[PDB]
Design a protein around this nucleic acid. Structure first.
Ligand SMILES: [K+]
Ligand SMILES: [K+]
Ligand SMILES: [K+]
Ligand SMILES: [K+]
Ligand SMILES: [K+]
Ligand SMILES: [K+]
Ligand SMILES: [K+]
Ligand SMILES: [K+]
Ligand SMILES: [K+]
Ligand SMILES: [K+]
Ligand SMILES: [K+]
Ligand SMILES: [K+]
Ligand SMILES: [K+]
Ligand SMILES: [K+]
Ligand SMILES: [K+]
Ligand SMILES: [K+]
Ligand SMILES: [K+]
Ligand SMILES: [K+]
Ligand SMILES: [K+]
Ligand SMILES: [Mg+2]
Ligand SMILES: [Mg+2]
Ligand SMILES: [Mg+2]
Ligand SMILES: [Mg+2]
Ligand SMILES: [Mg+2]
Ligand SMILES: [Mg+2]
Ligand SMILES: [Mg+2]
Ligand SMILES: [Mg+2]
Ligand SMILES: [Mg+2]
Ligand SMILES: [Mg+2]
Ligand SMILES: [Mg+2]
Ligand SMILES: [Mg+2]
Ligand SMILES: [Mg+2]
Ligand SMILES: [Mg+2]
Ligand SMILES: [Mg+2]
Ligand SMILES: [Mg+2]
Ligand SMILES: [Mg+2]
Ligand SMILES: [Mg+2]
Ligand SMILES: [Mg+2]
Ligand SMILES: [Mg+2]
Ligand SMILES: [Mg+2]
Ligand SMILES: [Mg+2]
Ligand SMILES: [Mg+2]
Ligand SMILES: [Mg+2]
Ligand SMILES: [Mg+2]
Ligand SMILES: [Mg+2]
Ligand SMILES: [Mg+2]
Ligand SMILES: [Mg+2]
Ligand SMILES: [Mg+2]
Ligand SMILES: [Mg+2]
Ligand SMILES: [Mg+2]
Ligand SMILES: [Mg+2]
Ligand SMILES: [Mg+2]
Ligand SMILES: [Mg+2]
Ligand SMILES: [Mg+2]
Ligand SMILES: [Mg+2]
Ligand SMILES: [Mg+2]
Ligand SMILES: [Mg+2]
Ligand SMILES: [Mg+2]
Ligand SMILES: [Mg+2]
Ligand SMILES: [Mg+2]
Ligand SMILES: [Mg+2]
Ligand SMILES: [Mg+2]
Ligand SMILES: [Mg+2]
Ligand SMILES: [Mg+2]
Ligand SMILES: [Mg+2]
Lengths: 45, 77, 41
RNA sequence: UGUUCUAACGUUGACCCGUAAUCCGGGUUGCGGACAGUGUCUGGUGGGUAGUUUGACUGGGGCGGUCU
RNA sequence: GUUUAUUAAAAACACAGCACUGUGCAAACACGAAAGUGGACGUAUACGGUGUGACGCCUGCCCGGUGCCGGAAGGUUAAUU
RNA sequence: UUUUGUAUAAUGGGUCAGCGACUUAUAUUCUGUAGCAAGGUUAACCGAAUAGGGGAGCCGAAGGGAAACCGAGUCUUAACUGGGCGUUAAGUUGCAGGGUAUAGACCCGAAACCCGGUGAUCUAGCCAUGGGCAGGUUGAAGGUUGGGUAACACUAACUGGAGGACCGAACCGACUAAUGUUGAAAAAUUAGCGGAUGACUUGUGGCUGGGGGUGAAAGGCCAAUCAAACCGGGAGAUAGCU
RNA sequence: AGGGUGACAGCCCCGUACACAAAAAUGCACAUGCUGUGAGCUCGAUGAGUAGGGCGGGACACGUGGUAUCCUGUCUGAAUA
RNA sequence: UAAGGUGAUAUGAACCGUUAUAACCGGCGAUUUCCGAAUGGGGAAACCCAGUGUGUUUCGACACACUAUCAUUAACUGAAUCCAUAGGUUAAUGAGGCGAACCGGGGGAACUGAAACAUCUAAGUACCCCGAGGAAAAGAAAUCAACCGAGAUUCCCCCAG
């Protein structure tokens, strides 16, 4: 059966990538939270 | 934004109060009007977005004094 | 609004006449067309 | 104690310029014109939306009855 | 044709057709504190809303209630003064 | 454990080890105990000072009355033969403890409400741009020719190739049954079944966001979640219940 | 003080008390330059769409109350020693 | 400062050094790819593609620098439109982004409590947003007091539940 995750790198990057995060205040707050938590991987990029 | 260029009047918040004293949040807006003011020193019309109160200030002080105040703030017109 | 007439204005008076007009009449007509000036001194 | 007027204001008419631009602004002009529209105040309407209430006793509950 | 992905596929939904009703254009209507945008680069043979549901024969009586539409004399009635 | 009552066929525990529930702060009252006593005690602060300073305050030594006010009395009433409350009992500050108050207030547990974000890689609808539909049927309009007509109409043959047309693979579905139900599979397999040029189907990308979307409408769908998604926060919500 | 060392170290080791140290950069505190800044004195001046008001709301411990005072969205509007 | 040393897992190898250029420690310098505010344009971060000026070429090319946006100021220029103004280009200066709390401001819940609930509460709390500083804010009486007086603001203890 067709499951929910149907990977596409283009859609992944456009939806959740670094530049998508940087494009809005709320996306930049995601990056701020993840840097503050000390995440090794900030985004899907 | 709904801001008087002369006075700086802007929307403020408060309550509607019913007879039963139910408070619901509201805004109070300034009575703003875009108006073409004759500037006889410059021989031209300057359009300002002004409250009716701001219009009374211009009548009292004169447009030259008011535009000088706008230049001091950096309020462009 | 008190103004000083400069040109002779009909239904008002003559040069130098102190007269009370509605603020709209002064603001939008008499002053921009150089017929009156605000009574400043 | 009617309408008329233009100058505020409107223009999602035309033309000109910023300009390589169906935005915007400025200008010219026509039309409308103290109307429309907006602010504050105010009467109406308002399950469109919201917060809630909608009792207890009881040979289960409800219905009926009851409550001093 | 459509539908309850995973217990209902149907008589349910839709449908062409019909009717009522709104709408003169900066349309009604909708999204939007707004600017705007859709409606439509359409213009009443158009567009929205509502009900009915091919076609055939048809669709009677009631406007008192509730709504809507029109009226505007009189009563009542807000801020204001 | 809960109960009127449980061997109960009521609850809970497979076993062991480890962890797991009346606390803390401040106020207030009572008891004990210690100090001082008609007094007791200081707060902040100063001080290198657990000292010492600091008595601002607080409690007590007087009550009665709504109060002015009076005062071992006072209030009541015009006034008490009176009557009510008082006089006729030592307090206060530590320390320990019992209770109360405010706080999560013995611990664990909702369904929910609100705020800010993340999500249309599933799915719903739409937008743009590409792709798919073996094979076989049926034979609409129209056309040509002949007949027919005053001319039409009409009518026969040939032609023509319409359709949410027909039969049927791919493709899209999901009507029945059996199996499976700690599955091969958190929805399938097998045999049959419906649509199959369309209101069709499919690839890639895009747009719509939560009281919001989208819905040929089932409260359906919005990432195995939907009569209000998910994540984080208000947050230890509250829980007269277990 | 404390730590280390083959078990528990004042005297084995590193320290500790105490006494000293900076080529260079630098915080600070005073000192005297330059640059700008101008004090003193006499005479005069003394914050208007403001205070105050009406309407609506908010803030004040103070819920419109008999409600002073403050803020102002809206309409107004003084006296100025 | 030195008789040792070439960071760790982690030995080895090849070496360096022992009286001072081994190593080590501190001050001041140098170097400092690419992404990131990211700033030459673009972009699915760590990539793609330029313009201009200079300098160097073995004519194949190579090197370096600059080129964002906004604000302010100045110069040159410059519409409709006569003067003009808008507008345009260049230059100089500044900004931008990040950061745990505290601080000022713009907005601002609900659960909850009231043994229901609407006034009220929770609370101007949580949260969102803007801005700042080493602190911020406040501050030198159109203040209190009570006929006596005090003398800006802030913070602490009382007053007092
Ligand atoms: K015009
Ligand atoms: K009008
Ligand atoms: K009974
Ligand atoms: K019974
Ligand atoms: K079916
Ligand atoms: K009727
Ligand atoms: K029981
Ligand atoms: K049972
Ligand atoms: K106690
Ligand atoms: K005691
Ligand atoms: K007595
Ligand atoms: K005692
Ligand atoms: K709690
Ligand atoms: K407790
Ligand atoms: K929701
Ligand atoms: K030792
Ligand atoms: K006023
Ligand atoms: K509430
Ligand atoms: K309750
Ligand atoms: Mg509230
Ligand atoms: Mg009107
Ligand atoms: Mg309603
Ligand atoms: Mg309701
Ligand atoms: Mg509630
Ligand atoms: Mg309820
Ligand atoms: Mg009952
Ligand atoms: Mg069918
Ligand atoms: Mg089903
Ligand atoms: Mg089924
Ligand atoms: Mg339109
Ligand atoms: Mg029907
Ligand atoms: Mg029992
Ligand atoms: Mg027994
Ligand atoms: Mg048994
Ligand atoms: Mg048992
Ligand atoms: Mg039980
Ligand atoms: Mg059990
Ligand atoms: Mg007393
Ligand atoms: Mg105690
Ligand atoms: Mg998204
Ligand atoms: Mg077919
Ligand atoms: Mg289906
Ligand atoms: Mg099958
Ligand atoms: Mg069929
Ligand atoms: Mg078929
Ligand atoms: Mg239903
Ligand atoms: Mg789902
Ligand atoms: Mg809900
Ligand atoms: Mg809470
Ligand atoms: Mg809980
Ligand atoms: Mg040993
Ligand atoms: Mg003054
Ligand atoms: Mg005052
Ligand atoms: Mg006022
Ligand atoms: Mg007043
Ligand atoms: Mg008022
Ligand atoms: Mg108020
Ligand atoms: Mg009261
Ligand atoms: Mg860039
Ligand atoms: Mg770049
Ligand atoms: Mg490019
Ligand atoms: Mg309650
Ligand atoms: Mg700083
Ligand atoms: Mg300051
Ligand atoms: Mg005095």
């Amino acid at each position: 059966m067709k499951r929910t995750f149907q990977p596409s790198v283009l859609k992944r990057n456009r939806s959740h990538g670094f530049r998508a995060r940087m494009a809005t205040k709320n996306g930049r707050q995601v990056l701020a939270r993840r840097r503050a938590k000390g995440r090794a991987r900030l985004t899907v990029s | 934004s709904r801001v008087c260029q002369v006075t700086g009047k802007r929307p403020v918040t408060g309550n509607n109060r019913s007879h039963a004293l139910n408070a619901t949040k509201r805004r109070f807006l300034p009575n703003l009007h875009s108006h073409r003011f004759w500037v006889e020193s410059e021989k031209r019309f300057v359009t300002l977005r002004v409250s009716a109160k701001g219009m009374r200030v211009i009548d009292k002080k004169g447009i030259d004094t008011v535009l000088a105040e706008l230049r001091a703030r950096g309020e462009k017109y | 609004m008190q103004v000083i007439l400069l040109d002779k204005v009909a239904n008002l008076g003559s040069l130098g006449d102190q007269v009370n007009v509605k603020a709209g009449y002064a603001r939008n007509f008499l002053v921009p067309q150089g017929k009156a000036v605000p009574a400043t001194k």
